[PDB]
Protein backbone atom coordinates (compact mmCIF):
# COMPACT_ATOMS: atom_id res chain seq x y z
CA UNK A 1 0.00 0.00 0.00
CA UNK A 2 3.08 2.21 0.21
CA UNK A 3 3.20 2.22 -3.59
CA UNK A 4 -0.45 3.29 -3.65
CA UNK A 5 0.26 6.08 -1.16
CA UNK A 6 3.21 7.43 -3.13
CA UNK A 7 1.25 7.18 -6.39
CA UNK A 8 -1.55 9.17 -4.77
CA UNK A 9 0.92 11.81 -3.58
CA UNK A 10 2.48 12.04 -7.05
CA UNK A 11 -0.94 12.39 -8.70
CA UNK A 12 -1.99 15.06 -6.19
CA UNK A 13 1.20 17.00 -6.92
CA UNK A 14 0.58 16.59 -10.65
CA UNK A 15 -3.00 17.92 -10.60
CA UNK A 16 -2.18 20.75 -8.14
CA UNK A 17 0.32 22.60 -10.31
CA UNK A 18 -1.09 26.06 -9.60
CA UNK A 19 -3.77 27.89 -7.66
CA UNK A 20 -5.82 28.48 -10.81
CA UNK A 21 -6.07 24.74 -11.48
CA UNK A 22 -6.81 23.81 -7.87
CA UNK A 23 -9.49 26.52 -7.62
CA UNK A 24 -11.07 25.38 -10.89
CA UNK A 25 -11.13 21.75 -9.75
CA UNK A 26 -12.59 22.67 -6.35
CA UNK A 27 -15.29 24.84 -7.91
CA UNK A 28 -16.17 22.12 -10.43
CA UNK A 29 -16.49 19.53 -7.67
CA UNK A 30 -18.49 21.91 -5.46
CA UNK A 31 -20.98 23.38 -7.95
CA UNK A 32 -21.97 20.07 -9.62
CA UNK A 33 -21.05 20.97 -13.20
CA UNK A 34 -21.35 17.41 -14.53
CA UNK A 35 -24.69 17.00 -12.75
CA UNK A 36 -25.96 20.23 -14.33
CA UNK A 37 -24.84 19.06 -17.78
CA UNK A 38 -26.61 15.72 -17.32
CA UNK A 39 -29.74 17.58 -16.21
CA UNK A 40 -29.56 19.75 -19.33
CA UNK A 41 -29.32 16.70 -21.61
CA UNK A 42 -32.23 15.12 -19.72
CA UNK A 43 -34.31 18.28 -20.23
CA UNK A 44 -33.45 18.29 -23.93
CA UNK A 45 -34.79 14.75 -24.25
CA UNK A 46 -37.84 15.69 -22.20
CA UNK A 47 -38.59 18.43 -24.73
CA UNK A 48 -37.67 16.37 -27.81
CA UNK A 49 -40.12 14.20 -29.74
CA UNK A 50 -40.88 10.65 -28.63
CA UNK A 51 -40.40 7.32 -30.41
CA UNK A 52 -43.28 5.39 -28.84
CA UNK A 53 -44.99 3.25 -31.47
CA UNK A 54 -48.64 3.50 -30.30
CA UNK A 55 -49.02 -0.27 -30.58
CA UNK A 56 -52.55 -1.27 -31.65
CA UNK A 57 -52.90 1.36 -34.39
CA UNK A 58 -49.26 1.71 -35.49
CA UNK A 59 -47.18 -1.44 -35.88
CA UNK A 60 -43.44 -1.92 -36.17
CA UNK A 61 -41.73 -2.42 -39.52
CA UNK A 62 -41.18 -5.94 -40.83
CA UNK A 63 -39.55 -7.72 -43.78
CA UNK A 64 -40.90 -10.15 -46.39
CA UNK A 65 -38.37 -12.68 -45.06
CA UNK A 66 -40.13 -12.73 -41.70
CA UNK A 67 -40.61 -15.96 -39.74
CA UNK A 68 -44.06 -15.66 -38.19
CA UNK A 69 -46.72 -18.38 -38.25
CA UNK A 70 -46.19 -21.70 -40.02
CA UNK A 71 -48.75 -22.23 -42.79
CA UNK A 72 -49.50 -24.38 -45.84
CA UNK A 73 -50.23 -23.07 -49.34
CA UNK A 74 -52.08 -24.31 -52.42
CA UNK A 75 -51.59 -24.18 -56.17
CA UNK A 76 -53.59 -21.62 -58.19
CA UNK A 77 -55.79 -24.45 -59.47
CA UNK A 78 -56.78 -25.37 -55.92
CA UNK A 79 -54.91 -28.58 -55.20
CA UNK A 80 -52.68 -28.88 -52.15
CA UNK A 81 -49.18 -27.64 -52.91
CA UNK A 82 -47.68 -30.12 -50.43
CA UNK A 83 -46.47 -33.44 -51.73
CA UNK A 84 -45.59 -35.87 -48.95
CA UNK A 85 -41.84 -35.64 -49.39
CA UNK A 86 -41.32 -35.43 -45.60
CA UNK A 87 -38.49 -32.90 -45.90
CA UNK A 88 -40.19 -30.82 -43.19
CA UNK A 89 -39.42 -33.05 -40.22
CA UNK A 90 -36.18 -34.37 -41.71
CA UNK A 91 -34.72 -30.87 -41.28
CA UNK A 92 -36.90 -29.45 -38.45
CA UNK A 93 -34.30 -29.06 -35.67
CA UNK A 94 -36.93 -29.07 -32.91
CA UNK A 95 -38.86 -32.01 -34.44
CA UNK A 96 -42.07 -29.97 -34.22
CA UNK A 97 -43.60 -31.41 -37.42
CA UNK A 98 -45.24 -34.83 -37.66
CA UNK A 99 -46.46 -36.07 -41.05
CA UNK A 100 -48.17 -39.24 -42.28
CA UNK A 101 -49.38 -39.93 -45.80
CA UNK A 102 -50.81 -42.44 -48.24
CA UNK A 103 -51.77 -42.58 -51.90
CA UNK A 104 -54.91 -40.57 -52.67
CA UNK A 105 -57.92 -41.81 -54.66
CA UNK A 106 -56.54 -40.60 -58.01
CA UNK A 107 -53.01 -41.87 -57.35
CA UNK A 108 -51.62 -38.51 -56.23
CA UNK A 109 -49.13 -38.39 -53.35
CA UNK A 110 -50.75 -36.30 -50.61
CA UNK A 111 -50.38 -36.03 -46.85
CA UNK A 112 -53.21 -37.58 -44.84
CA UNK A 113 -51.90 -36.03 -41.61
CA UNK A 114 -49.69 -32.98 -41.08
CA UNK A 115 -49.40 -31.31 -37.68
CA UNK A 116 -46.99 -28.70 -36.32
CA UNK A 117 -46.50 -27.80 -32.67
CA UNK A 118 -46.35 -24.03 -32.27
CA UNK A 119 -45.05 -24.65 -28.74
CA UNK A 120 -42.13 -26.66 -30.17
CA UNK A 121 -41.46 -24.78 -33.41
CA UNK A 122 -38.49 -22.46 -32.94
CA UNK A 123 -39.60 -20.34 -35.92
CA UNK A 124 -36.41 -20.87 -37.89
CA UNK A 125 -37.64 -21.27 -41.47
CA UNK A 126 -35.73 -24.49 -42.17
CA UNK A 127 -38.89 -26.18 -43.48
CA UNK A 128 -39.92 -23.24 -45.67
CA UNK A 129 -36.48 -23.27 -47.32
CA UNK A 130 -36.32 -27.08 -47.51
CA UNK A 131 -39.68 -27.28 -49.28
CA UNK A 132 -39.11 -28.32 -52.92
CA UNK A 133 -42.54 -26.97 -53.95
CA UNK A 134 -42.82 -23.90 -51.67
CA UNK A 135 -45.75 -25.58 -49.92
CA UNK A 136 -45.01 -24.75 -46.28
CA UNK A 137 -44.19 -21.09 -45.64
CA UNK A 138 -43.70 -19.23 -42.38
CA UNK A 139 -46.38 -16.61 -42.84
CA UNK A 140 -46.14 -12.93 -41.92
CA UNK A 141 -48.70 -13.32 -39.14
CA UNK A 142 -47.32 -13.32 -35.60
CA UNK A 143 -50.24 -12.14 -33.43
CA UNK A 144 -51.78 -15.57 -32.89
CA UNK A 145 -51.41 -15.91 -29.13
CA UNK A 146 -53.79 -18.58 -27.83
CA UNK A 147 -55.21 -19.23 -24.38
CA UNK A 148 -54.65 -23.01 -24.60
CA UNK A 149 -51.75 -25.29 -25.48
CA UNK A 150 -54.16 -27.54 -27.39
CA UNK A 151 -55.10 -24.50 -29.49
CA UNK A 152 -51.39 -23.91 -30.08
CA UNK A 153 -51.11 -27.53 -31.33
CA UNK A 154 -51.88 -27.04 -35.03
CA UNK A 155 -52.78 -29.59 -37.70
CA UNK A 156 -53.20 -29.84 -41.47
CA UNK A 157 -56.65 -28.25 -41.67
CA UNK A 158 -55.62 -25.23 -39.60
CA UNK A 159 -52.40 -24.81 -41.58
CA UNK A 160 -54.32 -24.98 -44.86
CA UNK A 161 -56.91 -22.44 -43.72
CA UNK A 162 -54.10 -20.14 -42.55
CA UNK A 163 -52.52 -20.42 -45.99
CA UNK A 164 -55.83 -19.71 -47.71
CA UNK A 165 -56.43 -16.68 -45.48
CA UNK A 166 -52.93 -15.23 -45.88
CA UNK A 167 -52.41 -16.38 -49.48
CA UNK A 168 -52.08 -12.91 -51.01
CA UNK A 169 -49.53 -11.51 -48.54
CA UNK A 170 -47.61 -14.80 -48.52
CA UNK A 171 -47.55 -14.71 -52.32
CA UNK A 172 -46.23 -11.14 -52.36
CA UNK A 173 -43.51 -11.98 -49.84
CA UNK A 174 -42.65 -15.16 -51.75
CA UNK A 175 -42.25 -13.22 -55.00
CA UNK A 176 -40.06 -10.60 -53.32
CA UNK A 177 -37.87 -13.26 -51.69
CA UNK A 178 -37.70 -15.58 -54.71
CA UNK A 179 -36.09 -12.55 -56.29
CA UNK A 180 -33.50 -12.83 -53.48
CA UNK A 181 -32.76 -16.49 -54.29
Amino acid sequence: TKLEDEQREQLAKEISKDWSSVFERSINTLFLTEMVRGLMLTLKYFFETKVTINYPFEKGPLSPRFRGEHALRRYPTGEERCIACKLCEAICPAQAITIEAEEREDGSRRTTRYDIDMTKCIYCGFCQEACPVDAIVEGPNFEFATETHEELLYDKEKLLENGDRWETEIAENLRSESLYR
Binding site: P76, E102, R110, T112, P132, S178
Partner: protein, 71 residues
Protein backbone atom coordinates in the same frame (compact mmCIF):
# COMPACT_ATOMS: atom_id res chain seq x y z
CA UNK B 1 -63.05 -39.81 -50.27
CA UNK B 2 -61.62 -41.80 -47.36
CA UNK B 3 -58.28 -39.97 -47.53
CA UNK B 4 -59.91 -36.54 -47.75
CA UNK B 5 -62.22 -37.32 -44.84
CA UNK B 6 -59.20 -38.62 -42.93
CA UNK B 7 -57.21 -35.40 -43.14
CA UNK B 8 -60.18 -32.97 -43.21
CA UNK B 9 -63.44 -32.78 -41.26
CA UNK B 10 -65.03 -29.57 -42.58
CA UNK B 11 -67.03 -31.48 -45.27
CA UNK B 12 -68.62 -28.17 -46.32
CA UNK B 13 -66.02 -26.55 -48.59
CA UNK B 14 -64.62 -28.11 -51.75
CA UNK B 15 -61.68 -30.44 -51.19
CA UNK B 16 -58.57 -30.01 -53.37
CA UNK B 17 -59.33 -33.30 -55.12
CA UNK B 18 -62.64 -31.97 -56.44
CA UNK B 19 -61.05 -28.70 -57.58
CA UNK B 20 -58.22 -30.49 -59.38
CA UNK B 21 -60.74 -32.81 -61.04
CA UNK B 22 -62.83 -29.78 -62.06
CA UNK B 23 -59.94 -27.96 -63.74
CA UNK B 24 -60.06 -29.14 -67.39
CA UNK B 25 -57.22 -30.99 -69.13
CA UNK B 26 -54.69 -28.80 -70.92
CA UNK B 27 -54.43 -29.45 -74.66
CA UNK B 28 -50.88 -29.24 -76.03
CA UNK B 29 -49.62 -29.67 -79.59
CA UNK B 30 -46.34 -31.44 -78.84
CA UNK B 31 -45.64 -34.96 -77.63
CA UNK B 32 -43.90 -33.84 -74.42
CA UNK B 33 -44.58 -31.00 -71.99
CA UNK B 34 -42.77 -29.08 -69.25
CA UNK B 35 -44.88 -28.89 -66.09
CA UNK B 36 -43.77 -26.13 -63.73
CA UNK B 37 -46.72 -25.34 -61.46
CA UNK B 38 -47.54 -21.76 -62.44
CA UNK B 39 -46.47 -18.90 -64.71
CA UNK B 40 -43.25 -18.38 -62.71
CA UNK B 41 -40.94 -21.43 -62.80
CA UNK B 42 -39.10 -20.22 -59.69
CA UNK B 43 -42.37 -20.13 -57.70
CA UNK B 44 -43.75 -23.51 -58.78
CA UNK B 45 -42.42 -27.05 -58.43
CA UNK B 46 -39.43 -28.90 -59.93
CA UNK B 47 -39.85 -29.27 -63.68
CA UNK B 48 -41.63 -32.46 -64.73
CA UNK B 49 -41.63 -33.78 -68.29
CA UNK B 50 -44.72 -35.80 -69.19
CA UNK B 51 -45.14 -38.31 -72.01
CA UNK B 52 -48.43 -38.12 -73.90
CA UNK B 53 -48.51 -41.24 -76.09
CA UNK B 54 -51.30 -42.83 -74.04
CA UNK B 55 -54.79 -41.66 -75.09
CA UNK B 56 -55.89 -40.86 -71.54
CA UNK B 57 -54.87 -37.59 -69.84
CA UNK B 58 -51.56 -37.79 -67.98
CA UNK B 59 -51.34 -36.44 -64.43
CA UNK B 60 -48.35 -34.19 -63.78
CA UNK B 61 -47.59 -35.90 -60.41
CA UNK B 62 -46.84 -32.32 -59.35
CA UNK B 63 -49.72 -29.83 -59.36
CA UNK B 64 -51.52 -32.50 -61.38
CA UNK B 65 -52.95 -30.78 -64.44
CA UNK B 66 -53.81 -33.54 -66.97
CA UNK B 67 -52.02 -32.49 -70.14
CA UNK B 68 -53.42 -34.10 -73.30
CA UNK B 69 -51.85 -34.24 -76.75
CA UNK B 70 -53.67 -32.25 -79.42
CA UNK B 71 -54.00 -34.90 -82.13
Amino acid sequence: SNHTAKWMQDTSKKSPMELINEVPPIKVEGRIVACEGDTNPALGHPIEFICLDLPEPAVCKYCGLRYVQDH
